[PDB]
Design a protein around this nucleic acid. Structure first.
Ligand SMILES: Cc1cn([C@H]2C[C@H](O)[C@@H](COP(=O)(O)O)O2)c(=O)[nH]c1=O
Ligand SMILES: Cc1cn([C@H]2C[C@H](O)[C@@H](COP(=O)(O)O)O2)c(=O)[nH]c1=O
Lengths: 318, 318
DNA sequence: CATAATAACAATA
DNA sequence: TGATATTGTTATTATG
DNA sequence: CATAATAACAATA
DNA sequence: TGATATTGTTATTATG
């Protein structure tokens, strides 16, 4: 197996961070680079294990989620440097207990949310704002609007979404479009990777397609197109966060802060409330419109956080 | 660790089967008994492994579910004979691949069902039948009725259910009772084991409680009380199956045969349709009324098989 | 004298 | 079923 | 001459 | 997160 290699992306991030006007020192990226460095020439399991042990000792005062993420970074770096067949990939990993605990906590949270939904009182107002954003000229705004109206992830919307009209009968669908470029998915049998599939929209198709075309033809939209996730995050995450904070501050449910993904949650809820066929379940429908894998009904549980004032009403009926 | 022991239950089942007027030969129970026999005196891992290998070779032309079940029987027998700390418990197990495949298939099935629900057209008729069964004098019938009206498992209903009135305000609840004696659960932190909890009923509480009291005071009901699962199965499973076949044959959804558990599914569906508070989800509610563990929302997915004609209607609205 | 900028830190799906 | 890819939030750094 | 009875076999949650 | 407890269905056996 390869004994030498370089994690190019890490080295490039580190190099670009040399001439920075301000900001944190890239200590983590540096530890990873030095890690991949020390790995060069290693042929003994125990040495590798000692190196990894050192790194694990380092990130001691961190959150479990944080440590798990960092381990992801290290593993991706090792994989980029030496390939998939390097023994370090068997060593550079967290306790099974850590992952089990993460799963546990996740389930507890989700179940807590299912036990006490948040009534989205002013949801129509939010949807309306998102629709007005489709007419805005600032591509950030068009983006937010498309998130609210299509329930696509930010990364998807800005950097890689392919929207096309959805053919209904022998014309075009008024309330659905064709989305391609699903994120967070590897190539596989039951995945939506590279799969163009029909999703519902919360306004006219023509509107969404027009706005998307505009955003996509904007200079900033051309900058966004094909971006990596890190590039997109560093480029836009805070601006998008602050903007979404600003737009929905007055009309968002008081139990939580306005977040971009909340538009995806709410999109799922509303789309189900308006378009769901009579023979599928809420989980199945969510899984369908969100682009989850086939036979995956467990991820849909993550998106059931709100209840509509109407449902709340005709449940109080009772 | 213990080198000798006896699987008493297996030996007793085998002994009682000696003087049988008819029926299959207990070949499996015999293989298990001979297994536990051969284990007596074994102190070498490789010997144990060879024995287990022999047994695995035996059940070769079986279904995966079957093999998994049999392995459960063997493991329970070993555990009963030698205790929890016997090395064989590390050997007597199936491939991880077998279990993974079982999980896979299960998820595929469940998702298929969520994709294509069965419209329970004549559900009110079924519920009515179940209500009439509460007035019947045959404790089998009272039992079926209580299954339909409380959504308790057969084993629970007949052998171990403790129903009491549910106090509403300062009177009694009309539409809910207190159930104790949840099955398929070990003692634990988030389990309903030994936990008395409030479940909804699909008729008046008084009715259900009266019928349950009658069934419980019947001679057959006194025979049922405290029975093991095997005893109950051999005593009643076929009669219950044939009877439920008979009662609902005309009015059951044409896509499937009338089965006892279908009353539990339908119970969950209807109970949600009638009593669900405005701030919980369908999964959470199911999990609540069915007695599933806290933070367990995945088992509830198993019970979403039907859709009501009404929901089908006001989904076609659309 | 103090803020924008950056990546660490962290949580979600 | 092994151990990721996104989104969300805070402490630290350089800069007339 | 043929059926009730039993446990194997199998699937579900 | 390791490897169960129920419910549902079929082949085999003993019996004037
Ligand atoms: C979608 C999803 C994925 N995962 C997976 C993705 C990673 O492959 C895995 C951790 O390794 O967790 C969850 O734990 N929860 C989820 O909701
Ligand atoms: C309730 C439930 C349990 N299980 C568990 C129970 C057993 O402990 C385990 C197999 O070992 O499977 C499922 O696989 N699916 C379910 O729906």
């Amino acid at each position: 197996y390869p004994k030498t290699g370089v994690a190019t992306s890490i080295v490039e991030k580190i190099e670009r961070a040399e001439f920075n006007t301000a900001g944190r020192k890239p200590t983590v990226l540096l530890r990873i680079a030095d890690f991949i460095a020390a790995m060069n020439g290693m042929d003994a399991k125990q040495d590798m294990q000692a190196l990894w042990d050192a790194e694990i000792a380092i990130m001691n005062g961190r959150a479990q989620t944080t440590i798990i993420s960092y381990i992801t970074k290290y593993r991706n770096a090792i994989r980029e440097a030496f390939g998939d067949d390097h023994p370090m990939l068997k060593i550079a990993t967290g306790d099974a207990a850590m992952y089990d605990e993460a799963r546990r906590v996740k389930m507890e949270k989700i179940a807590n949310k299912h036990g006490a939904l948040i009534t989205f009182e002013n949801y129509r107002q939010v949807l309306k704002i998102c629709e007005d954003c489709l007419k805005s000229s600032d591509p950030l705004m068009i983006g937010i609007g498309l998130i609210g109206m299509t329930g696509r992830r930010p990364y998807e919307v800005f950097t890689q979404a392919e929207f096309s009209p959805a053919p209904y009968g022998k014309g075009v669908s008024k309330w659905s479009i064709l989305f391609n470029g699903q994120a967070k998915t590897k190539q596989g049998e039951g995945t939506k990777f590279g799969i163009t599939y029909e999703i519902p929209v919360l306004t006219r198709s023509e509107t969404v397609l027009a706005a998307y075309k505009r955003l996509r033809e904007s200079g900033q939209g051309k900058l966004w197109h094909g971006m990596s996730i890190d590039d997109f995050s560093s480029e836009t995450r805070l601006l998008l966060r602050d903007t979404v904070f600003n737009l929905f501050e007055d009309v968002w449910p008081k139990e939580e802060l306005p977040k971009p993904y909340g538009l995806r949650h709410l999109y799922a809820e509303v789309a189900y409330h308006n378009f769901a066929p009579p023979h599928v379940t809420k989980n199945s429908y969510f899984a369908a419109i969100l682009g989850h894998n086939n036979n995956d009904l467990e991820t849909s549980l993550s998106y059931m956080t709100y209840t509509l004032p109407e449902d709340r009403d005709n449940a109080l009926a009772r």
